Amino acid sequence: TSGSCKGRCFELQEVGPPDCRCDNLCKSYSSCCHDFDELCLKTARGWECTKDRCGEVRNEENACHCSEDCLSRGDCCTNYQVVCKGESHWVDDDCEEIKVPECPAGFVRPPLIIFSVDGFRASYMKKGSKVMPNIEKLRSCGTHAPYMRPVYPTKTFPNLYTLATGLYPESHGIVGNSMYDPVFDASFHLRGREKFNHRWWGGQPLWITATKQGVRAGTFFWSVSIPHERRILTILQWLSLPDNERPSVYAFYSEQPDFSGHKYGPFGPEMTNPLREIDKTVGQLMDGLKQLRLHRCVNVIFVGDHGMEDVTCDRTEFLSNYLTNVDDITLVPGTLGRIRAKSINNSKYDPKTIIAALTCKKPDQHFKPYMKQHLPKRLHYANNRRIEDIHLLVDRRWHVARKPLDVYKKCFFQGDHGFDNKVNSMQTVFVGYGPTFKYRTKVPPFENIELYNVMCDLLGLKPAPNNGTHGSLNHLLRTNTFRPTMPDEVSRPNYPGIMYLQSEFDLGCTCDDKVENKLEELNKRLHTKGSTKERHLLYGRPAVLYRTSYDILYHTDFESGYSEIFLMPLWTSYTISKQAEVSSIPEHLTNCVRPDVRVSPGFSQNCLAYKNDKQMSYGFLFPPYLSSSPEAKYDAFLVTNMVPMYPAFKRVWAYFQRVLVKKYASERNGVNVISGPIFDYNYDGLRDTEDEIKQYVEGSSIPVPTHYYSIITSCLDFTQPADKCDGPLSVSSFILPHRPDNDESCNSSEDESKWVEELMKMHTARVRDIEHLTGLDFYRKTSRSYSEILTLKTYLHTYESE
Numbered sequence: 001t002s003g004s005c006k007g008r009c010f011e012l013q014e015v016g017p018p019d020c021r022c023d024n025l026c027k028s029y030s031s032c033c034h035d036f037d038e039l040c041l042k043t044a045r046g047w048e049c050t051k052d053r054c055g056e057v058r059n060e061e062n063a064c065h066c067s068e069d070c071l072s073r074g075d076c077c078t079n080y081q082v083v084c085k086g087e088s089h090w091v092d093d094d095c096e097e098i099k100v101p102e103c104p105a106g107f108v109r110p111p112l113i114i115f116s117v118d119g120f121r122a123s124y125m126k127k128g129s130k131v132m133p134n135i136e137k138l139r140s141c142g143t144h145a146p147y148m149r150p151v152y153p154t155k156t157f158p159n160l161y162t163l164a165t166g167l168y169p170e171s172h173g174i175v176g177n178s179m180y181d182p183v184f185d186a187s188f189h190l191r192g193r194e195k196f197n198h199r200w201w202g203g204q205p206l207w208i209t210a211t212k213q214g215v216r217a218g219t220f221f222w223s224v225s226i227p228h229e230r231r232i233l234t235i236l237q238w239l240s241l242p243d244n245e246r247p248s249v250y251a252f253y254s255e256q257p258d259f260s261g262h263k264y265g266p267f268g269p270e271m272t273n274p275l276r277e278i279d280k281t282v283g284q285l286m287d288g289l290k291q292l293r294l295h296r297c298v299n300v301i302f303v304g305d306h307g308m309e310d311v312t313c314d315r316t317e318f319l320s321n322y323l324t325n326v327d328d329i330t331l332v333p334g335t336l337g338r339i340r341a342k343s344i345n346n347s348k349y350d351p352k353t354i355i356a357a358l359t360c361k362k363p364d365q366h367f368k369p370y371m372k373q374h375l376p377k378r379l380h381y382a383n384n385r386r387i388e389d390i391h392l393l394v395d396r397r398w399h400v401a402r403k404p405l406d407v408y409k410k411c412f413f414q415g416d417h418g419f420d421n422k423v424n425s426m427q428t429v430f431v432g433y434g435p436t437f438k439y440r441t442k443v444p445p446f447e448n449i450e451l452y453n454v455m456c457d458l459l460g461l462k463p464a465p466n467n468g469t470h471g472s473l474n475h476l477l478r479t480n481t482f483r484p485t486m487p488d489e490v491s492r493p494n495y496p497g498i499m500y501l502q503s504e505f506d507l508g509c510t511c512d513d514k515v516e517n518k519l520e521e522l523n524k525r526l527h528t529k530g531s532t533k534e535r536h537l538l539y540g541r542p543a544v545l546y547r548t549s550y551d552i553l554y555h556t557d558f559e560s561g562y563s564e565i566f567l568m569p570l571w572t573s574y575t576i577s578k579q580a581e582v583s584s585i586p587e588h589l590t591n592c593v594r595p596d597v598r599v600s601p602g603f604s605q606n607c608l609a610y611k612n613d614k615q616m617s618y619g620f621l622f623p624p625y626l627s628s629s630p631e632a633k634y635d636a637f638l639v640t641n642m643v644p645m646y647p648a649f650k651r652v653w654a655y656f657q658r659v660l661v662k663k664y665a666s667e668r669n670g671v672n673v674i675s676g677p678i679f680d681y682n683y684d685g686l687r688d689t690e691d692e693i694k695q696y697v698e699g700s701s702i703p704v705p706t707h708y709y710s711i712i713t714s715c716l717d718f719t720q721p722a723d724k725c726d727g728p729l730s731v732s733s734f735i736l737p738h739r740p741d742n743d744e745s746c747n748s749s750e751d752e753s754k755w756v757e758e759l760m761k762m763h764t765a766r767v768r769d770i771e772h773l774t775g776l777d778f779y780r781k782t783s784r785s786y787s788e789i790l791t792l793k794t795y796l797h798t799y800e801s802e
């Protein structure tokens with residue numbers, strides 16, 4: 001470490017060791033040159049020009065300069081021009097639209113500066129507005145969302161690395177603020193050097209995507225000791241490098257307001273200061289850019305990782321209050337719980353009994369236990385060996401801790417984060433400002449997984465495969481690199497006619513249906529042939545994006561895509577107008593299941609299988625309850641409308657079909673509903689192939705769904721009915737887990753009106769989540785632009801307050 005940093009402070013291109021370093025990571029590696037702080041971390045005279053300093057003789061020891069050569073040397077204090085040249089601060093200037101990039105010669109593309117702020121809760125934009133004039137100018141003049149949804153867990157590393165990669169934590173591998181990997185036999189902590197081993201960090205983050213494609217990056221790590229002022233001056237110096245050396249993408253990171261927020265709560269009186277400070281740093285950057293003539297050239301993204309909630313020690317739940325075998329578990333504690341065996345050499349560890357002991361045990365309990373595969377699918381928090389089989393979702397405002405000793409042998413804090421990512425307090429911020437973003441534009445809330453695609457667009461890069469839906473944020477941008485196209489249908493449907501006689505079927509099924517007009521039979525003929533298909537299929541048939549064998553089946557009240565491989569529909573589509581009336585399954589038709597004369601015995605389910613199977617009953621995708629007439633109801637009992645359902649789950653499903661659909665049709669002015677099965681036995685969030693199914697209705701080839709979905713669409717303008725909508729659509733969807741019990745809902749021994757809807761809300765989902773899980777592609781035929789449809793497909797209905 002004997003070498004010098006002279007003239008190589010914060011050098012971008014790296015050197016070969018044991019040879020001393022001068023970059024942000026050097027303190028962490030103990031590899032800094034002995035003159036690092038002296039040369040690279042000057043502080044003399046502070047950060048601002050004062051009037052007396054103007055035009056001075058250059059003293060190389062000052063932190064920044066007011067000397068005449070400073071603009072060209074690229075190292076003035078950010079307020080130099082204001083003080084020494086009578087320029088105005090960036091914030092005081094009117095905002096003027098940036099129609100085209102106004103860049104100095106040599107700039108091949110507008111730079112991107114990612115200004116990331118830790119714990120910057122969405123509502124600070126309104127609530128701290130009086131003290132954040134620079135940020136508020138960015139926000140009102142550029143493009144902003146009311147809030148941006150983080151990913152689960154709403155911790156710092158999982159979310160910054162999601163921003164950088166477009167990946168769910170389960171895919172990028174940073175699934176928590178601390179992690180045990182069972183194959184590394186290693187722990188990853190906020191403290192320590194293990195976290196610096198590359199083996200934890202999957203996917204391809206923006207700085208690597210940028211390099212691999214010939215675009216240079218400034219640092220995406222800043223030392224905690226390096227003050228924010230020196231961080232801004234470093235970015236400003238790099239922006240003054242020669243064309244061949246100068247990076248195109250930059251990052252800034254603020255520890256605030258998160259650092260304070262943990263101490264004082266999200267709205268503690270001590271929070272106003274951190275917000276003033278962040279604002280001042282933004283002011284410095286914008287003043288700096290304006291000096292360099294870059295303030296109408298650079299795209300600036302102001303983005304937070306997660307919000308902040310009120311959490312205190314006395315609001316902790318202790319596992320020792322639930323389990324007696326509390327010493328046989330390791331818990332990752334806090335705003336989420338992850339339990340594994342304290343030792344794998346122990347074959348006396350039983351997760352089922354742990355779960356059981358943690359379920360609805362206290363009238364008011366503030367967490368809920370889940371096997372990871374049972375977590376709401378919208379959290380995408382299962383497909384990683386680092387995520388423990390046992391998970392606890394903790395209520396907002398609470399903590400889980402193992403024993404009382406852990407909170408008083410380790411009250412300090414008033415704020416925390418990490419809860420479910422639909423929680424209002426966890427929402428964070430997005431503002432984009434620059435030539436490539438729109439002018440004075442509000443966009444709807446979106447998920448942070450979408451940004452990697454946009455940052456690649458902004459930089460002319462081709463994104464690595466990721467979890468955003470590329471095009472879903474084209475409406476943020478003035479000019480678009482990416483023009484999305486609908487994927488091609490892989491399998492085209494069959495359209496079978498009447499090909500089988502009743503007596504050919506031997507399904508163990510029975511129906512009371514043999515009751516004694518010519519016009520009446522041509523009417524019904526037109527039905528089985530797609531007459532009301534434009535009423536029940538409002539957005540075109542979904543496209544199957546994989547290779548398979550399936551039949552389109554028309555009926556009076558509904559239309560389906562019936563899979564000959566899975567022996568049940570992939571999808572069933574139907575419209576319930578506001579006027580539509582509910583009826584009951586008449587008594588003689590309770591056990592009614594009818595063969596479908598369009599589909600072979602061999603590609604049909606049978607009732608026998610359901611008899612012999614003591615666990616499994618069955619339900620219907622189009623609900624009998626909602627048939628338009630007594631004759632049409634017979635359609636609802638076709639064996640091709642049937643699906644396997646646990647009796648426990650039928651309680652949920654029956655309430656949704658009998659009560660909730662009609663309610664939605666009344667509130668929304670008609671709804672269109674597409675429901676179907678989902679198979680995700682390997683919990684990867686993607687459609688299972690046949691050979692992945694772990695469970696069949698006993699002694700049959702009838703596969704059992706892990707989940708059931710519905711997509712419920714209507715007109716955004718609810719003065720128009722769902723079936724005659726001229727403009728933007730409105731959607732909400734869910735993916736309900738197909739479970740043999742209702743342990744998840746503590747009050748399920750009450751009437752369905754007390755719990756079912758609360759459960760469905762918990763399992764709300766994006767249409768895009770259902771697409772991954774089914775291999776289907778929806779909304780193929782609408783009057784809407786494809787970009788708008790992508791936005792709709794990424795929409796999540798969250799059921800939170802405002």
Ligand SMILES: *[C@@H]1O[C@H](CO)[C@@H](O[C@@H]2O[C@H](CO)[C@@H](O[C@@H]3O[C@H](CO[C@H]4O[C@H](CO)[C@@H](O)[C@H](O[C@H]5O[C@H](CO)[C@@H](O)[C@H](O)[C@@H]5O[C@H]5O[C@H](CO)[C@@H](O)[C@H](O)[C@@H]5O)[C@@H]4O)[C@@H](O)[C@H](O[C@H]4O[C@H](CO)[C@@H](O)[C@H](O)[C@@H]4O[C@H]4O[C@H](CO)[C@@H](O)[C@H](O)[C@@H]4O)[C@@H]3O)[C@H](O)[C@H]2NC(C)=O)[C@H](O)[C@H]1NC(C)=O
Nearest residue numbers: 170171172173201202203383384385465466467684685772
């Ligand atoms: C969100 O977006 C992401 C990104 O697009 C989606 O994830 C992708 O999904 C693909 C499908 O699951 C998957 O493709 C597979 O890749 C296998 C090789 O994987 C390596 O290479 C890639 C490319 O560089 C790399 O990204 C991978 O990185 C993973 O693994 C390491 C750890 O080992 C981590 O550093 C990293 O975080 C990442 O981990 C994640 O992925 C793995 C699985 O890949 C998970 O297990 C982890 O939990 C974690 O989430 C890897 O370095 C490739 O071998 C596969 O090919 C198999 O299948 C094809 C079918 O086409 C077939 O030709 C072969 O038979 C082959 O099977 C053989 O191997 C089997 C497995 O051992 C064996 O059982 C068989 O018998 C066969 O011998 C496959 O193509 C892709 O890797 C990931 N990418 C990422 C970044 O995660 C994700 O699905 C999206 N999510 C949603 C909800 O939509």
Ligand SMILES: CC(C)(C)C(=O)Nc1cc(C#N)ccc1COC(=O)N1C[C@@H]2CN(C(=O)c3ccc4[nH]nnc4c3)C[C@H]2C1
Nearest residue numbers: 114116118156160161163164190220221222251252253258
């Ligand atoms: C992997 C990495 C470097 C974190 C990353 O992706 N960074 C990235 C991507 C983009 C983007 N896109 C934009 C900016 C960046 C900026 O990163 C950085 O300089 N750092 C962020 C780390 C946060 N941190 C903590 O110790 C911490 C831990 C637990 C906490 N709870 N509550 N507050 C916490 C703070 C050290 C800071 C170093």
Ligand SMILES: CC(C)(C)C(=O)Nc1cc(C#N)ccc1COC(=O)N1C[C@@H]2CN(C(=O)c3ccc4[nH]nnc4c3)C[C@H]2C1
Nearest residue numbers: 014021023024025026029031195196197198199201220221
């Ligand atoms: C630069 C980057 C990748 C954004 C980063 O710092 N990421 C990050 C932030 C935090 C934190 N906090 C925690 C973990 C991570 C992820 O780590 C990684 O994947 N890597 C970082 C290692 C740095 N490195 C070097 O050879 C090196 C470079 C510069 C040096 N100066 N002095 N000694 C040095 C040694 C190989 C990189 C692999």
Ligand SMILES: [Ca+2]
Nearest residue numbers: 680686687688
């Ligand atoms: Ca799957």
Ligand SMILES: [K+]
Nearest residue numbers: 610613616617
């Ligand atoms: K049964």
Ligand code: NA
Nearest residue numbers: 742743745748
């Ligand atoms: Na229950």
Ligand SMILES: [Zn+2]
Nearest residue numbers: 119258262417
């Ligand atoms: Zn924090």
